[PDB]
Amino acid sequence: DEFPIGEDRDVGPLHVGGVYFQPVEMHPAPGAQPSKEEADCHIEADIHANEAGKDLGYGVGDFVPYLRVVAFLQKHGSEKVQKVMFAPMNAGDGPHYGANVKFEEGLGTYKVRFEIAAPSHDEYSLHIDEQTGVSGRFWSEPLVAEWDDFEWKGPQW
Amino acid sequence: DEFPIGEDRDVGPLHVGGVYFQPVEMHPAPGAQPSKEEADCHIEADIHANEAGKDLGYGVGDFVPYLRVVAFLQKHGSEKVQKVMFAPMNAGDGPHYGANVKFEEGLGTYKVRFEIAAPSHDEYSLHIDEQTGVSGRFWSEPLVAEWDDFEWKGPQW
Numbered sequence: 001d002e003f004p005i006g007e008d009r010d011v012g013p014l015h016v017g018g019v020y021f022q023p024v025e026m027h028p029a030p031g032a033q034p035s036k037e038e039a040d041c042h043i044e045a046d047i048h049a050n051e052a053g054k055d056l057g058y059g060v061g062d063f064v065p066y067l068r069v070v071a072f073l074q075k076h077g078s079e080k081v082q083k084v085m086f087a088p089m090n091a092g093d094g095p096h097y098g099a100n101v102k103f104e105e106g107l108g109t110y111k112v113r114f115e116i117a118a119p120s121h122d123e124y125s126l127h128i129d130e131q132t133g134v135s136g137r138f139w140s141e142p143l144v145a146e147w148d149d150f151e152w153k154g155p156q157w
Numbered sequence: 158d159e160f161p162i163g164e165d166r167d168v169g170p171l172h173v174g175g176v177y178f179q180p181v182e183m184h185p186a187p188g189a190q191p192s193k194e195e196a197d198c199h200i201e202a203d204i205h206a207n208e209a210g211k212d213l214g215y216g217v218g219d220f221v222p223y224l225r226v227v228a229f230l231q232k233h234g235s236e237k238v239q240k241v242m243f244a245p246m247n248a249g250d251g252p253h254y255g256a257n258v259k260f261e262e263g264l265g266t267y268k269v270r271f272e273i274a275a276p277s278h279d280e281y282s283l284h285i286d287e288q289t290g291v292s293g294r295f296w297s298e299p300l301v302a303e304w305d306d307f308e309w310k311g312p313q314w
């Protein structure tokens with residue numbers, strides 16, 4: 001089972017969903033994420049183009065690759081913030097941005113914020129000529145999708 | 158308007174098409190590719206998952222991101238080979254890999270080869286747990302789509 005972090009958000013050209021479920025094993029194991037055994041769960045950000053995404057050239061529903069996605073978790077009652085760097089990966093059901101996560105502050109209700117940066121100038125381009133190009137341009141400040149009352153009560157699996 | 162490089166190829170889990178048309182302006186201008194004015198044409202590699210791609214977790218027909226695509230162009234009867242690193246980008250028709258290029262030995266018949274490497278070790282992962290993961294793996298030797306008799310007969314525009 002997948003469990004929602006909250007209701008899907010539309011922000012700019014992106015439709016953004018968040019879900020969590022059991023920790024997974026990834027190859028290669030990304031960055032500094034906890035192993036399947038060490039982690040509390042896996043959290044994924046599903047990011048697909050919405051209608052406004054067409055101005056950048058995307059088809060509506062297309063996965064949007066080359067983004068840099070980071071999550072920030074803050075337990076209600078705490079001033080501590082945990083930063084989670086998501087990584088691009090495929091599961092059985094396709095390309096996602098995801099991470100194994102261990103909640104440093106434990107059980108409780110959290111504010112969960114996804115900050116989504118556009119592809120680096122070095123890593124992606126847009127056709128901009130009249131004939132073949134697109135009208136839109138990538139966003140400069142990261143797009144934000146946030147849920148304010150995410151309840152972490154331990155594994156639901 | 159797009160012109161064909163040759164017949165579409167299926168290689169491993171990828172369906173690969175090659176087209177060319179007038180040089181384009183890109184933002185930012187990628188790597189060391191020629192400008193719109195300096196180039197002879199823009200060449201695109203259109204790469205989507207085929208049925209064998211479903212084992213890697215891709216939706217069949219999905220664009221396959223994070224690949225490293227390099228084109229080699231060699232005029233018939235010549236020992237000179239041009240190496241062109243393609244860049245990921247969007248045009249009005251969506252994400253693809255491509256480049257502005259010059260045909261450096263002028264008009265005539267060229268061998269055109271796309272070598273397609275899987276994502277860098279640190280750029281992508283697969284879920285591999287039995288529960289959420291996939292049973293396929295990335296290819297180790299780059300995949301090759303090639304056309305032995307592409308005719309560069311100059312701008313068709």
Ligand SMILES: [Co+2]
Nearest residue numbers: 008009015017
């Ligand atoms: Co939705």
Ligand SMILES: [Co+2]
Nearest residue numbers: 010014015050
């Ligand atoms: Co939407």
Ligand SMILES: [Co+2]
Nearest residue numbers: 046093094096
């Ligand atoms: Co999903």
Ligand SMILES: [Co+2]
Nearest residue numbers: 044089096098
């Ligand atoms: Co994942």
Ligand SMILES: [Co+2]
Nearest residue numbers: 121138184185
């Ligand atoms: Co820019």
Ligand SMILES: [Co+2]
Nearest residue numbers: 201246248255
């Ligand atoms: Co292009």
Ligand SMILES: [Co+2]
Nearest residue numbers: 027028278295
């Ligand atoms: Co590997």
